[PDB]
Specification:
This is part of a larger assembly, with chains A (about 400 residues) and B (about 1150 residues). Chain A has about 400 residues and is mostly beta strands. In chain A, about 10% of the residues lie in helices and about 40% in strands. In chain A, strands 1, 27, 28, 29 and 30 form a five-stranded antiparallel beta sheet that branches. In chain A, strands 22, 23, 24, 25 and 26 form a five-stranded antiparallel beta sheet that branches. Among the domains of chain B are: about 350 residues, Methylamine Dehydrogenase, Chain H (7 Propeller); about 325 residues, Methylamine Dehydrogenase, Chain H. In chain B, strand 75 and strand 76 form a beta hairpin. The radius of gyration of chain B is 32 Å and the shape is globular. In chain B, about 55% of the residues are buried. The chains are: A mainly beta (about 400), B mainly beta (about 1150). Chain A: Pathway: Protein modification; protein ubiquitination. Chain A: Keywords: Cytoplasm, Cytoskeleton, Nucleus, Phosphoprotein, Repeat, Ubl conjugation pathway, WD repeat.
Amino acid sequence: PPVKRSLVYYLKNREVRLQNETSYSRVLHGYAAQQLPSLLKEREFHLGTLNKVFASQWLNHRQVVCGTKCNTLFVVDVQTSQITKIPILKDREPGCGIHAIELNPSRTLLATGGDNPNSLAIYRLPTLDPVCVGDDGHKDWIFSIAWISDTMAVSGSRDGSMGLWEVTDDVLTKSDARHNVSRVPVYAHITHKALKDIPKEDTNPDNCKVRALAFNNKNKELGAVSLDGYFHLWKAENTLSKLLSTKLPYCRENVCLAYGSEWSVYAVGSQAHVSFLDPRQPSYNVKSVCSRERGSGIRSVSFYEHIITVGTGQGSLLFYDIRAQRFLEERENLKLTTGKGWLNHDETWRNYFSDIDFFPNAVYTHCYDSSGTKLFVAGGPLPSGLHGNYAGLWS
Amino acid sequence: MSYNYVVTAQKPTAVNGCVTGHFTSAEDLNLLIAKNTRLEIYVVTAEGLRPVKEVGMYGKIAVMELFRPKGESKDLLFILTAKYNACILEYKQSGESIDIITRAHGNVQDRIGRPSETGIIGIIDPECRMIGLRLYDGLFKVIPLDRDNKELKAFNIRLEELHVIDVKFLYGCQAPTICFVYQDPQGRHVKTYEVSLREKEFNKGPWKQENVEAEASMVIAVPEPFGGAIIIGQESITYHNGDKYLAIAPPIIKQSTIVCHNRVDPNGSRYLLGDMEGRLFMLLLEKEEQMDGTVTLKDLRVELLGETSIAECLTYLDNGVVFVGSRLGDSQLVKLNVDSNEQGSYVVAMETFTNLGPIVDMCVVDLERQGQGQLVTCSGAFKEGSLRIIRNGIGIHEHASIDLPGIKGLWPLRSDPNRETDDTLVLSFVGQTRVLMLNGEEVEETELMGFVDDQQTFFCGNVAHQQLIQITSASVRLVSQEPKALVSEWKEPQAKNISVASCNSSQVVVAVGRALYYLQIHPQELRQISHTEMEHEVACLDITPLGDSNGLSPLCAIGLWTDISARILKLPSFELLHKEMLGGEIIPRSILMTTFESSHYLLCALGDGALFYFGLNIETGLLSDRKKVTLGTQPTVLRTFRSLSTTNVFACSDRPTVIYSSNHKLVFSNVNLKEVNYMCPLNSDGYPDSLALANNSTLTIGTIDEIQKLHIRTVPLYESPRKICYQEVSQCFGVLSSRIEVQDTSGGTTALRPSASTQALSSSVSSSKLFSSSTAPHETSFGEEVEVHNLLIIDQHTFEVLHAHQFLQNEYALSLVSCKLGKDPNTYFIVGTAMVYPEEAEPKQGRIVVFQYSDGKLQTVAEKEVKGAVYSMVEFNGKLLASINSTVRLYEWTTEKELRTECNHYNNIMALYLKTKGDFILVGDLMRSVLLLAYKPMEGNFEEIARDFNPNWMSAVEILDDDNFLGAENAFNLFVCQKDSAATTDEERQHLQEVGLFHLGEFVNVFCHGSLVMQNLGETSTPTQGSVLFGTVNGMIGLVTSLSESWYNLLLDMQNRLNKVIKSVGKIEHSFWRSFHTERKTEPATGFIDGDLIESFLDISRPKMQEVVANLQYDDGSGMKREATADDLIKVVEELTRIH
């Protein structure tokens, strides 16, 4: 008996739901994943005067959370094109911006940077109610966040450390009880369970900053990208412990990490190429694909089935087809481009960039919705010295 | 902003759960069936299941269990809906009035939390101390069952195990003890804990967690003396109770997964086990008495009983009878025999419960040319596949037909004095009379001695003293049953011809001209007592008995030839007690006195098709509560009949209708027949509870089906249906279906079971070679299952399988449409097919084949090759619009009867469904929801206007109006897209706007333009705009129409007020049920009017109607708000049943 992969069987079985198999979902989404990118339309939103958007996640079918350089957390309602802000939470003591946002596997806890860039703030979903006080576990700014479990989260920092925070059954039970009983939410006080540093390899030990984190739910692995040119793999099934390290083909601008669950491949960005890493392969056996946007840098990366979406400093998004081992062509590589958004002609611009009136809005974050047909794109000007924002929904 | 009206025309039929226990009385066993939002109560008897009451609940039922708190005489029924609505119900009956009274209710939804991935599970402690509910991952809700706990509030207790598949309370424990099976990454384990309500914490139970089969899923609570619980997996069953551990691995269960169970014996000695494959198993418990006085399980035994329809829940009745509740097919009531059949099964079905779900496709056609439309749906799969014919009205099964044109009336007679059943039927004709002999199922012409054959009969029937009465134009003849001879005759003193007549057991009334004569019936003698003279000639008169009288009626209803009115005369003196003006253009043709549920009513029909009905007070002879309904344009005749243990009235007209009572209120529903002129009841040995219906040219003999607002007829296929369409020119439906054959060693295939594709009167096989260039890698393998597709042709009137056409090997038929093409008035069957192999993710080649059914044979007309699989096809202004993979193409109809592409649209992923209205095309996509296309005949191409940016995996699409386009979400919500004519930017213009959010509670699988009741056919007299029917996975069929701004605001205030007053079963707040519901968030409903809320008022018994209407402001459509009465909400419901 041969394996049936045709969508025809899916369609006729779906009409009856008579033990319809889930094995057809891979073909359903992959087929659309190849055709969707060329049919998307741009829906730009006005973000006001927010500095930049660095991270975003889908919270509902209508809203996407976005983090900013000014530590302001907000949600873009793509269904009504409205902007709603979220209060910034303070730390336990009065002792940059939000570079990463992640959702727990249960989609009940939102982890973002707090008022202090070195502190993690926890928000409740879908209500956006505060969950916990900003921590002080890190001695420097937090650049990466990843949820390793429904109760545990790991956050990186400029010094290469990764804080391990765990919510116990008692803390979670009381937190949930308070939010459902009391109309006014009450946040709990938290501290990090442990603090561990990435392994010190023969590469630059000083440039050990962890810029991106990604969690593999299937193998319970926590991947980490450092700017020293090495990738680090840690176990995060129950406790935080190092597993392996591999060498990247490029050691510049390694700022984004994504994991392909259907391919067991870690995608690491660089100044120009996306690295394809396999923990089962030798540390030197890493493939690289050039985004063709040389000199601008890769700012974001994500997997949509077998299609890898790559965001660059020119404000464009490239699509790479793993099965075809090539970039998708437009119906000439197919690419989406960001709009003008909002640029701040402030004193810093006047002092350093006065010779250029407009800069393209780099793609700092993007994310696909649960259906895979809506792609949220957000960012801002590529230069670190400029302020400005962009966001839009591609559909 | 657009507004829409959503109403359910046919209640959900799929079973979602079922239980057994003492629900209606302390001694009788009861069977309760939950069909999504509907709860149906049945009494268990030796003969079968007897329905007593059915109630509509405001929510989808996920948990339903019986329990008996201390001090209660019968078990209480608890329900937990998917909308977190908890309620405790108790059965209450007073005389003939039956209803379900809510004992407690409340919503347990939390603002934050992840809904449980294993579904909604609920359990009740054996001692009735609390109800345990699993709504969210990691949280266990406890509801204390205190007698004063009017609100069923629940508290969350944290459980260490987040993902639990099944949970049950243990029997025999002193403290409330829960046993559950949960799945860890290392396998599944079973653990138990005690529940502390005061501490809100779980403590270690009587025994430690044990490792069980990795597939362990179902848990059976085992009542005493056994106690403990039984864990059921894929290959083995394990029993846990304290220190006792027992496990068995029957090979007979290894091929199927057990999904449901039920207790067989009150002591827990036996349990039922059901599965997705339809294999029914008996689980037996061997008992061992312990030295400490307790009883524990000794061993486990499982036996295979036989095959049933797919089981969603099982319920044991008594005496070896098992009810098999089915969600994906018809539910079955089966008996377990000692001896097996020729197939080795011990299970024999006794009764079948119709289930429309899953509905895969459907179409609406006016096959009777009445303007109403008949909906035929494809339901089920494999051996359970069938067609379902749904129409607004009461169906009748035709068993015989005789060529008897010109019938002016029918009446049964009992010519044998030794029988209580009918054995003779009299046919009235102008200038003559004929008699039919009833011999079982056969009817033949005969002659009955003592009756006049050369005169028109106006009335006859059985009378007291073992005699028959016949009144003709010439005389009144009293004929004894034996020796079937005339015993007495009465003649008109005026020597004028009788024009109207009526008789009962002892009273005879004759109308000759203006005179009315009253005669008494005595043994072998007729006697004249009195007579009167009317101002005008009598057109009709009736003295039909009412209530429980012995064929007697003190009053006579009459109609006149001049003033078009109805009158009530008191016998014998013919005193006038009441005069009611009927009006209209044509005189009354028939007047009738009838009884519904012991309540007396009078009806009178005019020759212009108008029907007038009023409440009838016999004691005073007065009429009240007058209402008027128009049935048709042809004369209507009213006659009473007795069937299904109740009394009803049949109105014979060009649009026949049955008058019946439901919930103590009258409902007027049409009949699925072309036309009827006259009728009478039949109660013969071969036709008990039957009707004799005489039309313009023939006499129809048949039996009345179950009386419900919507009637369903089933045509089994025994193979999987796929698509359906109607061919008007041939008066047939086309149906795509498939059967499974096993390939033999000879290279040929053998069908596993016979089906419509092999049982058809005639058949043919496609001879095309288009796909002969490629074969499967297993084309010659042995033992592999091969799916073979066929196009079935079924008659629109009999629904019998006339022809079956088999498609080519490996050719799958994905879509089917039948319509007029080009300028050709003939309708053709157009089938979209594709070449499909297991290794090909997406077909690259397919074709569209046009067939014509004529002279009993289905002949292929033409075939057109297309670059891809054809997923959908629709009639578009006489053109063939087809979806081929990712491209939508419009085909013109050539003079050679072949399709040619004229224009196309490429901005899609995969167009799965097509429906059109006017010049607009609505396309359903695989993942991109719906898109709005418009056709420009002046340009000859398509222009894309806007598309929905809210992603959804569409199951079907349809257009409500030029601006309103209807779709459905996979989250049980409905949505309507509107073209944004107010848009100023390109982003706004290209985005279809949502005009509201409505939670239906059902997953819609198919949409179709049309209605189950008289359609407007383009007229604007209908208060709503557009008419689209939709079918769901649970067999629910509803109607969606557009509302004007005024209707929406009027009905929206009505809905918001009704939500707080209507006390439905469980007293669940309606506003929450209909609120937009997703796994992420809940939002208040807006932009839609729920018609089910108003119609739910018909389910609550009168005692509740008074409380609902009190302090309620109701808008009758005039815009004025006044306090509602019981009759106001009933009256509007009667109107609502006429729009869908």
